[PDB]
């Protein structure tokens with residue numbers, strides 16, 4: 039019969055992380071004979087994503103995979119989708135667990151929070167330090183889950199560190215650069231910026247270069263292709279991510295499994311070419327209390343620390 043149709047929705051288009059995730063989703067679609075539509079708003083917003091969800095539902099799509107800008111903002115549209123039998127998955131940034139079926143997740147908040155703090159500590163290497171957090175928004179699901187854990191870890195394991203500020207760049211290159219320059223100017227006693235956002239990290243690096251700020255540890259999460267110039271110049275020594283192309287791929291393979299009615303309750307696994315096995319984990323892995331039939335989290339097998347040694351191995 040007519041080929042299945044899956045939508046893959048980023049927080050916004052035109053950012054390398056999301057372009058690369060979309061590439062993985064679309065290549066998986068080709069391998070599986072599924073038509074995958076990559077579409078998102080030009081900036082992150084609830085209305086941008088909600089219209090797309092509603093459009094794809096109204097147009098008869100079989101599954102929608104979305105990286106949510108908000109835990110709650112998409113819920114009415116996603117609940118309508120699920121009421122109509124459209125498979126709903128999140129990837130990257132979750133909604134509330136009751137607003138989707140599966141979350142294709144790069145890592146637990148404990149894992150990702152730990153990565154951020156470990157990267158910072160490796161470079162700071164002193165007990166008394168001043169650190170700034172810098173990411174997209176105070177409401178986005180993923181980054182706030184990770185930052186809560188990173189801040190807890192700092193308070194426990196680095197008691198001499200002071201978090202002097204937490205500011206936001208809203209996935210906007212212009213606003214992010216201005217915010218980063220503002221942090222560096224306002225806090226001359228600053229030892230690290232921790233920037234778990236694909237736009238905030240290069241903005242912080244660029245701000246440090248613009249202001250000729252030296253010996254500032256700048257760590258966070260972004261893509262190798264975006265970060266490579268900053269790593270080459272030495273402004274960023276280390277940052278983290280994961281294979282976002284593979285994440286997009288996994289999301290489409292999981293959606294395919296749902297469309298084929300394969301067993302995907304907590305504990306079940308799924309074979310994916312070039313990856314091996316992925317498994318459905320409980321929602322409690324993300325800190326949620328919610329369990330239901332046909333609902334859980336699929337964790338990526340690995341995350342990656344990038345530095346000068348390995349950055350040229352990766353093209354995304």
Ligand SMILES: C[C@@]1(O)OC[C@H](O)C1(O)O
Pocket residue numbers: 049055105130131180181234235236237259260
């Ligand atoms: C990489 C990241 O931190 O920046 C944009 C994404 O939503 C992300 O995973 O949060």
